[PDB]
Amino acid sequence: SMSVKKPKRDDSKDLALCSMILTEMETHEDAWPFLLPVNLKLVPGYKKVIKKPMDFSTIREKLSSGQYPNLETFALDVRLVFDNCETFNEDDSDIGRAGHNMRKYFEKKWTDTFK
Numbered sequence: 001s002m003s004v005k006k007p008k009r010d011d012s013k014d015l016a017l018c019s020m021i022l023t024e025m026e027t028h029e030d031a032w033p034f035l036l037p038v039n040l041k042l043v044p045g046y047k048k049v050i051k052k053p054m055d056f057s058t059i060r061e062k063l064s065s066g067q068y069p070n071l072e073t074f075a076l077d078v079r080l081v082f083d084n085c086e087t088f089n090e091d092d093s094d095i096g097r098a099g100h101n102m103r104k105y106f107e108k109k110w111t112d113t114f115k
């Protein structure tokens with residue numbers, strides 16, 4: 001509360017660390033469904049069903065331009081990519097499996113890096 005501060009986690013390296021994690025995700029061989037925005041004009045159903053599209057190149061643009069206030073807002077966008085993937089793809093499809101694989105991959109990097 002007022003004039004009573006909790007000790008503050010050192011966040012000075014967060015930007016560099018999130019950038020490293022994003023790089024590792026960009027270079028994963030199962031990252032191909034997630035590198036670019038889904039084409040809303042060429043994929044039936046996507047625009048109406050998926051209220052907030054997100055993809056790695058969009059996350060990268062936002063990271064590079066000061067659009068994440070903190071590391072938690074970054075993790076929310078990454079998770080949104082995989083949440084969207086589950087909403088739209090069968091668990092047993094190449095893309096659906098790619099999504100599950102990348103989420104597992106991300107969450108371990110997240111834990112190892114910040115916890």
Ligand SMILES: CC(=O)Nc1ccc(C(=O)O)cc1
Nearest residue numbers: 033034038043085088089095
């Ligand atoms: C991220 C994501 O779901 N992408 C896509 C892209 C294309 C299709 C399709 O054409 O079936 C399905 C899903």
